[PDB]
Amino acid sequence: HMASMKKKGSVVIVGRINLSGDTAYAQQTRGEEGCQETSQTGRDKNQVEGEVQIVSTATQTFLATSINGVLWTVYHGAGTRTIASPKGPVTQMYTNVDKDLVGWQAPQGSRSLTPCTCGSSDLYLVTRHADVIPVRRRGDSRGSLLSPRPISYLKGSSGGPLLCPAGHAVGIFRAAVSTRGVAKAVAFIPVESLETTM
Ligand SMILES: COC(=O)NC1(C(=O)N[C@H]2CCCCC/C=C\[C@@H]3C[C@@]3(C(=O)NS(=O)(=O)C3(C)CC3)NC(=O)[C@@H]3C[C@@H](Oc4nc5c(nc4C)CC=C(OC)C5)CN3C2=O)CCCC1
Ligand SMILES: [Zn+2]
């Protein structure tokens, strides 16, 4: 009934991947109880830092990456949800189900990656566990892992970046190709497809 109808909560930043120094490591900035409360209110007063955020809904967790002032993630994680912010829920600025892509204005305090113009095919995928995984680019939206590993190790890293040797954004991780549970290849939204959308 219309009186009964519920509202989905916001996406919430619950941590980050720290790439500041010589060692990449994940940091949690909010626990599950505070995450649930912030998803319901959409009001997140925590300080945001860095380029790759770990984000959560009530039911899923994944990554979001700032590139050129937009916090980008996957539609299959975020759907059409708002993101929590200090002043309340923020509506998506970009939504493209056909690319599995959404974006919001990048949160104050975040740092944005620069879009890659190198044309390099030697990429690096950053996971929610702060693994930096070498990936050879194999097409506009595909790359192969140099060291395959079970898909378990990639689960929850959609929305994370593929970076070039110079640390620029080449794309947003979207999906994995699984052969008997082993990830041999990944698919990603290329940064040019974000640059078009903008
Ligand atoms: C043979 O057929 C295929 O396998 N084809 C493909 C393939 O589907 N692979 C699978 C293998 C899964 C097994 C686990 C893979 C591990 C990590 C994955 C990175 C990662 C991830 O981590 N998610 S997550 O953070 O955990 C989560 C779910 C919390 C957000 N994403 C995934 O699971 C995604 C989700 C889904 O894909 C899509 N859903 C949608 C859209 N577009 C895609 C492409 C567009 C519009 C939508 O509206 C709803 C939905 C299946 N996904 C795969 O990756 C592979 C080649 C191209 C597509
Ligand atoms: Zn580059």
Side-chain angles (χ1 to χ4, degrees), residues 16-18 24-28 54 127-130:
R16 79 181 62 96
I17 309 301
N18 195 301
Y25 62 105
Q27 307 170 276
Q28 191 178 256
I54 308 168
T127 72
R128 70 179 293 114
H129 308 297

Side-chain angles (χ1 to χ4, degrees), residues 48-86 88-110 112-141 143-179 181-190:
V48 169
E49 304 185 51
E51 304 89 358
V52 186
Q53 310 298 321
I54 308 168
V55 296
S56 300
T57 66
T59 58
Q60 296 197 111
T61 184
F62 46 104
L63 298 179
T65 303
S66 287
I67 304 164
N68 275 6
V70 179
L71 185 74
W72 298 101
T73 191
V74 285
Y75 187 90
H76 78 260
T80 59
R81 290 179 193 245
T82 53
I83 191 168
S85 87
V90 169
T91 295
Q92 287 178 19
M93 173 181 288
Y94 303 98
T95 313
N96 193 329
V97 70
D98 293 322
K99 299 177 181 174
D100 195 16
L101 182 65
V102 316
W104 309 266
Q105 61 211 65
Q108 209 196 326
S110 62
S112 271
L113 299 161
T114 295
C116 182
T117 58
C118 295
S120 174
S121 283
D122 294 329
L123 316 181
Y124 304 86
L125 173 70
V126 176
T127 72
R128 70 179 293 114
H129 308 297
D131 294 319
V132 178
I133 291 173
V135 172
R136 175 67 185 189
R137 196 176 188 164
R138 296 299 190 187
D140 53 3
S141 63
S144 57
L145 274 76
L146 270 55
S147 305
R149 63 204 74 189
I151 50 170
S152 307
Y153 286 100
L154 302 188
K155 178 180 190 293
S157 292
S158 71
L162 283 97
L163 306 178
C164 78
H168 317 132
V170 174
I172 295 295
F173 183 29
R174 162 168 83 196
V177 182
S178 148
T179 300
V182 178
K184 304 212 172 273
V186 290
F188 59 87
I189 301 124

